[PDB]
Amino acid sequence: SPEFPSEKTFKQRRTFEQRVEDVRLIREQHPTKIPVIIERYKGEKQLPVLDKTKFLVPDHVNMSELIKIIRRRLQLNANQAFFLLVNGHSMVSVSTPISEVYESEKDEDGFLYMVYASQETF
Numbered sequence: 001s002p003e004f005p006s007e008k009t010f011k012q013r014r015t016f017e018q019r020v021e022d023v024r025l026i027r028e029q030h031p032t033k034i035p036v037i038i039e040r041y042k043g044e045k046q047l048p049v050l051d052k053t054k055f056l057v058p059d060h061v062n063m064s065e066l067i068k069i070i071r072r073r074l075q076l077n078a079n080q081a082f083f084l085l086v087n088g089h090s091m092v093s094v095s096t097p098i099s100e101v102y103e104s105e106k107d108e109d110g111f112l113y114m115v116y117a118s119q120e121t122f
């Protein structure tokens with residue numbers, strides 16, 4: 001509805017220059033944390049909004065563990081599907097530690113971006 005404001009993403013809220021410097025600050029103060037931005041897919045109609053956007057994830061945590069953490073934050077029940085996507089592909093099947101996902105998939109600004117949805121392609 002045009003009466004209600006559109007959802008604005010992290011990259012629309014913070015400029016690239018600010019994001020680049022945020023990550024430099026984060027990396028300096030927390031070298032063992034991965035800076036992750038987790039957002040709901042723009043067209044999502046079945047899953048609620050997350051109470052935070054930026055997560056400093058310990059670098060040993062794997063993707064299966066992170067998925068459980070987000071499902072819990074969203075208070076999902078077991079009959080609700082949830083997919084976590086990085087750069088256009090699903091992280092749902094894997095046990096890769098997030099440290100490795102960061103090196104493979106991080107944005108130019110230094111953040112690792114993830115999108116969640118109730119479907120795997122859209």
Ligand SMILES: *C=C1C(=O)CC(c2cccs2)CC1=O
Pocket residue numbers: 052054055056057058
């Ligand atoms: C939103 C967060 C938290 O609630 C705590 C997380 C921590 C993980 C290990 C030590 S603190 C960081 C975070 O982004």
